[PDB]
A paper describes a structure:
Out of all of these potential roles, MELK is best characterized as a mitotic kinase, as its expression pattern highly correlates with other mitotic genes. At the protein level, MELK is hyperphosphorylated, and reaches its maximal abundance and kinase activity during M phase in both Xenopus embryos and human cancer cell lines.
Lastly, MRT199665, a pan-AMPK-related kinase inhibitor, showed reasonable potency against MELK (IC50 = 29 nM). The MRT199665 structure also revealed a type I binding mode. The pyrimidine and aniline nitrogen atoms from the core form dual hydrogen bonds with the backbone NH and carbonyl group of Cys89 in the hinge. Toward the deep pocket, MRT199665 hydrogen bonds with Lys40, while the dimethyl group abuts the gatekeeper L86, promoting a relatively open conformation of the N-lobe. The indene group is in van der Waals contact with Gly18 and Val25, but intervening residues in the P-loop are largely disordered. We postulate that the induced conformation upon binding of MRT199665 is more poised for the degradation response.
Author numbering: -2 to 19, 23 to 45, 54 to 153, 170 to 183, 187 to 333
The structure:
Amino acid sequence: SGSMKDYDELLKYYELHETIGTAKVKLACHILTGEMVAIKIMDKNIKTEIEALKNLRHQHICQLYHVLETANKIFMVLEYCPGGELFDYIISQDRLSEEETRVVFRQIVSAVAYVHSQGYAHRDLKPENLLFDEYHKLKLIDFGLGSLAYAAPELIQGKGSEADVWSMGILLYVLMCGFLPFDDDNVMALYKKIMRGKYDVPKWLSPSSILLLQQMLQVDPKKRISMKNLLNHPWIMQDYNYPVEWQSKNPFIHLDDDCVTELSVHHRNNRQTMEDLISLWQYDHLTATYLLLLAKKARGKPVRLR
Ligand SMILES: CC1(C)C(=O)N([C@H]2CCc3c(O)cccc32)c2nc(Nc3cccc(CN4CCCC4)c3)ncc21
């Protein structure tokens, strides 16, 4: 409602800053560690879609620190990405070079690789759900599930890991062309173009780009390249010479000694109790404190609390 009494349980742990997004989205501060976060504040009147994010932990998937649920609201503390929408960056520069695109597109593959490993399909890969962090590294976000220009042909018919490969195809195209491969003023026509499968091939595109694009943008799902072959594809490996490392560097089971020690001093508990406690991953204040500590370390900053 209009009520400000919900923000009470929140402001225990967090100190608010400006609004964005108006779900309303506020930039906040985690009091104990001082790290910036981003709170998705939702007014009841998708529960499971949260449980999804609880199991996903990966350096290009937007991290979930804390869930606060009252009878009047639900708050979602998430990694704050300063760099903004990938969409805005593409328009910002008209179009990306192959070398740059490759840097970005490798991060997108790593994430989508990973999500699939956990048996989830993102089903909404558009450059509006890829945001830059301060490192200018990419972070995937919306697991709510148009958007139509990114829909695989099979989804338009009715009838998938493979549909994600189609959208990554549309991504690669836009990244390197700066406009969509299938686009129109008239929706029914846009349906049509997509289903046909024919797109322009701008002069500035290398044949490697054209090859990969062709293998990803297959109108038939089975003829579409597979996640396996994509990871080490010759285009993907071009300046790197190692395949995409999609493996999570942020585990549920490997806890951090440096981080647990500091937390032990604050809660006045021993290393065993604390570790057992953190390992429950309740996504309460403890989960947010440990995770935000890891990040606080990942900046090479002091592993201290307030
Ligand atoms: C918690 C979460 C996941 C979220 O729900 N949003 C919303 C907020 C606006 C927005 C968006 O533009 C695209 C996707 C998601 C969201 C988020 N948005 C950011 N960072 C961000 C987004 C757009 C623009 C900018 C940069 N501008 C605005 C602030 C100064 C310059 C940053 N991080 C996390 C989220």
